Amino acid sequence: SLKHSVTQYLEEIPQQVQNRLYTSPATCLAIYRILPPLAKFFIMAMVFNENEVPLLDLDKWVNSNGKLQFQNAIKSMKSLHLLIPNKSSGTLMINLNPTFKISLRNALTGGEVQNSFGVVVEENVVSLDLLDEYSANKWETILHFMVGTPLAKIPSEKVLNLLKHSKLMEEVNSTGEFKITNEGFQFLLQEINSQLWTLLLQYLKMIETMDLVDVLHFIFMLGALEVGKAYKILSETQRIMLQDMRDYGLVFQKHSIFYPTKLALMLTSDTIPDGSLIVETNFKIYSYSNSPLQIAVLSLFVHLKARFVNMVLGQITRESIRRALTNGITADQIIAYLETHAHPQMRRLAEEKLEKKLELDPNCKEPLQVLPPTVVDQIRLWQLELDRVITYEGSLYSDFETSQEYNLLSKYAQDIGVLLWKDDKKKKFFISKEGNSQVLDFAKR
């Protein structure tokens, strides 16, 4: 939902603020990268002719088989205020955002970029030895800090405050310690560009006027940037948060020349295997992977034995399972990790068993779990045996009369999100004590 989250945020961004974002070619290039294929095709077609089109021509062009996907593309196109659809001459006359159009055109032609792709110094050096090494160092420090295994190099105070305020890896002030939230484990499960995008979305949400569009344009060009060169130190708000993301280890800055590491490239785009684990009914771990980070994250939910070159061995204990459970870490998160860490031989065996059971019966009279339930459902049985109850606390309305209070005001209560529970035949439904915003108002009628 990364593109969904960013698109949602930009839809939250108003129309003229969006148009301000559509001014510069680097921002337009990054946003074009965000757009789905259909809308990407539409804008690359229309960008080289100043002919507005009606919707009817596009509809006649569009094959109706993917019409839902077309609707999604144009819904994003309109809701981002990237389109100006007006019903001119009775027809919904389709118009791209013109600033976006011309900035995309200049980016494609290599025309006027105003160094939106970057105020270049072009003093290239080696990046694998300084930039990549410092980047790996700083990211290792922040990563083990997020893990909770002890490490001396604490992060910045800005990100420390952002973690304190945010629900990510809770620095619980009563305990004085960063603590793994379920959101923290979601961040741990996240892909690296997902983690970066969540971090920048949270930082953009917390940061206020520091010009928001300056941060937006700078973020987009920073994603647009390339590795291993010096560049001019631009807006000053951009410069100071550039120093901030220098302290994050994103850029290797020599206090004016700065050298962006590979993290900008991964932020822009992604780039018996490694990370593939053989499950065991004896809960033994046969990982085809090793890192001290791997051991650090496996310490949270796996009882391990020793570290060898790719062979990380161990045995999953129920103590490890319940250690994961008691942190608020979801068993769905656990199986997210597990099903992202499967192995070729065992998944081939699972697919062979699935194709064997397909011909016998469609249901098979077996629980729906594709990963082999000899080991996988043992956690899933422990997953179901973990939660296994439903608790309702607070207020409760009871002993109703007839279903005019259910199909008219409790069926409507599904549309507004105020009930915690719904039982028509019991003539009772449960709400939270604090969730009495619009519950004791229309139920009286």
Contact residues: another protein, CB under 8 A:
144, 149-151, 278, 280-282, 284, 286, 292, 295-296, 299, 303-309, 313, 317-318, 365-367, 373-374, 377-378, 381, 389-399, 421, 426, 428, 430
Quote the tokens at residue 329: 């870490």
Residue 3's H or E segment, with its range, is helix 2-12
CB of 26 to another protein, least distance (A): 36
Q: Which is nearer to another protein, 20 or 422 (CB)?
A: 422
Q: Which is nearer to another protein, 144 or 341 (CB)?
A: 144
Q: Judge contact between 279 and 372, C-beta under 8 A.
A: yes
CB of 394 to another protein, least distance (A): 7
For the CA atoms of 92, 94, 97, 101, what is the dihedral angle to 10 degrees? Answer: -170
User: Residue 201 to residues 6, 120, 123, 218, 412: CA-CA distances in angstroms?
Assistant: 8, 27, 31, 14, 34
Query: What single-letter amino acid sits at 183?
Result: E
The CA distance from 57 to 46, in Å, is 13
Angle, nearest 10°, between helix axes 212-224 and 236-247?
Answer: 60
CB of 333 to another protein, least distance (A): 21
CB of 393 to another protein, least distance (A): 5
DSSP 351-389: HHHHHHHHHH-SSTTS-S-SS-TTTHHHHHHHHHHHH--
Q: Which is nearer to another protein, 205 or 426 (CB)?
A: 426
Quote the tokens at residue 404: 């005019």
CB of 304 to another protein, least distance (A): 7
Q: Which is nearer to another protein, 433 or 445 (CB)?
A: 433
The CA distance from 242 to 248, in Å, is 10
CB of 435 to another protein, least distance (A): 14
Q: Which is nearer to another protein, 8 or 374 (CB)?
A: 374
CB of 392 to another protein, least distance (A): 5
Among the listed residues 214, 304, 217, 227, the one whose alpha carbon sits nearest the alpha carbon of residue 258: 227
Q: Which is nearer to another protein, 244 or 377 (CB)?
A: 377
Q: Judge contact between 373 and 380, C-beta under 8 A.
A: yes
Give the pairing of strands 396-397 and 303-307: unpaired
Angle at Cα 199 formed by Cα 114 and Cα 81, nearest 5°? Answer: 55
Q: Which is nearer to another protein, 15 or 374 (CB)?
A: 374
Q: Judge contact between 39 and 71, C-beta under 8 A.
A: no
CB of 426 to another protein, least distance (A): 7
CB of 299 to another protein, least distance (A): 6
Q: Which is nearer to another protein, 210 or 396 (CB)?
A: 396
Query: What single-letter amino acid sits at 105?
Result: R
Using CB atoms within 10 Å of the CB of residue 37, give its burial: 0 to 12 exposed, 13 to 18 middle, 19+ buried. Answer: exposed
Q: Which is nearer to another protein, 243 or 395 (CB)?
A: 395
The CA distance from 273 to 382, in Å, is 28
Q: Which is nearer to another protein, 108 or 409 (CB)?
A: 409
CB of 298 to another protein, least distance (A): 9
Q: Judge contact between 327 and 376, C-beta under 8 A.
A: no
Q: Whose structure tokens read 């917390």?
A: 206
Backbone angles phi, psi at 395, to 5 degrees: -75, 160
Q: Which is nearer to another protein, 117 or 397 (CB)?
A: 397
Quote the tokens at residue 254: 């020599």
Q: Judge contact between 37 and 48, C-beta under 8 A.
A: no
CB of 152 to another protein, least distance (A): 9
SS3 110: coil
